[PDB]
Design a protein around this ligand. Sequence first.
Ligand code: NDP
Length: 332
Amino acid sequence: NRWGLIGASTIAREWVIGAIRATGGEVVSMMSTSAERGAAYATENGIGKSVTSVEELVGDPDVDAVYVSTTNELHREQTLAAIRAGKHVLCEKPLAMTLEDAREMVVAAREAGVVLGTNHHLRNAAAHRAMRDAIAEGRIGRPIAARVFHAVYLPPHLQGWRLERPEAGGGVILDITVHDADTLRFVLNDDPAEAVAISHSAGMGKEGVEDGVMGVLRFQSGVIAQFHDAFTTKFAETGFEVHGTEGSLIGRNVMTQKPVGTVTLRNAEGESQLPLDPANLYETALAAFHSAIEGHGQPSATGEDGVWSLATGLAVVKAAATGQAAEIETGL
Ligand SMILES: NC(=O)C1=CN([C@@H]2O[C@H](COP(=O)(O)OP(=O)(O)OC[C@H]3O[C@@H](n4cnc5c(N)ncnc54)[C@H](OP(=O)(O)O)[C@@H]3O)[C@@H](O)[C@H]2O)C=CC1
């Protein structure tokens, strides 16, 4: 029920603070490296305390759970503080910057007996759940190939850290390709095995920073999945498709943060749009996380889910950089 925010972020402002409130919880405090900004942002968003120390946020006895949506080089040490305080943690993706860090987070949560969740939103969407369901109900026969299109335009207000400092987590692979990875795993119900990729810097990424990637994952089942992730492409709709021996599912406009997009089943009979019962992706994420901390079930995406999606993003990074296929090994 009662949250502390770490990070005065656009993600919490735009989506997660309201989803916490919509689903029965409260944000009692938050923490920013800036006294000035924290306090303005706490006022802007109806939060009663702001604080410039992590331990003050995390050791706040009125705080039950913590949301980490700081930049990526801070996810680990902050989520480890919350756990050491005995607070459950929803951490933003990518769960961390290295696999050893991500694994430590998952092992620390387990040993303290608190819930650790990665905020993969997409897997919450009715579109993706309906595709997961459709494949498990045989609607396409056996899956052969998937295709993910996540080439977007990074809006001017976000053209900051994402496009600089790859040492601090920027680049489109860590930011976006992690979502594709997790969404593939969710929908296909299967785990990737290796990646090949080619990345570029097509005018947005500063320095050695990629702003588009294309690649292919081999899944344990044998299915091959292509992805295109990009910050630079304004007029490319998003999409997620699975092609089977008896049907194709064609998701259009389904990779965004909003709860929109259609899913079309094509088979021998024709085409139709699968019926969707949509809801705000982060209200669903948060309702699940709230249930998890109450003892009922897991968060939508678990800390291990974020280890997998990171494992896949780092393979993709490696394959783009060396030109060599890269096995996805989580170490779990
Ligand atoms: N799952 C999902 O749907 C999404 C997840 N994310 C993830 O959440 C994280 C944050 O993303 P996002 O909210 O888009 O990024 P922002 O850039 O909005 O927020 C990140 C940090 O920027 C700092 N900041 C805010 N305003 C200023 C300013 N005026 N000058 C200097 N620094 C400022 C804040 O620092 P401080 O806290 O110290 O004030 C904050 O921690 C990333 O890990 C990203 O991957 C992002 C979008 C969606």
